Amino acid sequence: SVVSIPINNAGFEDPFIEVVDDYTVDTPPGWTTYNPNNLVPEKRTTWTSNNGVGYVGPGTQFYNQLAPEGRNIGYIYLAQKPGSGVAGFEQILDATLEPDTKYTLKVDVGNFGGEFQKISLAGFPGYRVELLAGDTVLAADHNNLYIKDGEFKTSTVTFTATPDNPYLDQKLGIRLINLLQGTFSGLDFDNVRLTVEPAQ
């Protein structure tokens, strides 16, 4: 009795990207830009703070593996100096928080390596993965995994809602966040999964 909750564009596969290591600079379809510190501008180009989708296939300089799922990942790049704030992706789901239910949110987090226009991509800004109900962060993984340049690791966030939880019936949400706590200050995400089961 482990059931999946649908997520739009959960693997960042829309839009299709043809060319090796190519990318978009606009918010991926199905997601919004989480921008609590106004770090990401409305109009983006390659070198502004931005987010978007990128193809990770044979030929890539970014990883010693391919995209965890499908062809593409979703990425967030922040140009401001470390400490300036955070930004990322948010998606509000149609599912609502239900009692006596354990939620498991999994997402693959990527620390790409390489060099872009003579700028080293070594280093990592840190990540946070959040599960929301309404405006409330129910549970989050703030940067617990060590992710070396060129690899992905799976973050797992869990939350159990009891019958007295104040946020029952509010819409579930997911945030994938660049913490901007190091350089090179970009990171990737892929393969967002949310499942439910009865509480322990």
Going by the annotation, the residues of the binding site for Ca(2+) are 11, 13, 22-23, 42, 69, 72, 111-112, 121, 123, 135, 149, 152, 190
> Which positions touch Ca ion (CB under 5 A)?
11, 67, 69-70, 72, 111, 121, 124, 149, 184, 190
Q: Which is nearer to Ca ion, 23 or 184 (CB)?
A: 184
- The least CB distance from residue 70 to Ca ion, in Å, is 4
- Output the DSSP codes for 93-138: EEEE--TTEEEEEEEEEEE--SEETTEE--S---EEEEEEETTEEE
3-class DSSP assignment, residue 3:
strand
Tell me whether residue 34 or residue 75 sits nearer to Ca ion (CB atom): 75
Residue 8 or 170: the one with the smaller Cβ distance to Ca ion is: 8
77 beta partners? 50, 186
Minimum Å gap between C-beta 64 and Ca ion is 13
In Å, how far are 7, 107, 188 from 193, measured between CA atoms?
Answer: 8, 6, 15
Q: Which of 82, 41, 38, 54 is nearest to 152 (CA)?
A: 54
What is d(CA 114, CA 150) in angstroms, rounded to the nearest whole number? 8
In the complex, least distance from residue 68 CB atom to Ca ion, rounded to whole angstroms? 6
Min dist CB 115 to Ca ion, Å, is: 10
Shorter beta-carbon distance to Ca ion: residue 51 or 111: 111
Taking the C-alpha atoms of residue 143 and residue 83, their distance in angstroms, rounded to an integer, is 15
Residue with tokens 């939350």: 159
Where is the binding site, in residues? Answer: 11, 13, 22-23, 42, 69, 72, 111-112, 121, 123, 135, 149, 152, 190
Kindly tell me which of 141 and 190 has the beta carbon lying closer to Ca ion: 190
Shortest distance in whole angstroms from residue 72 CB to Ca ion = 5
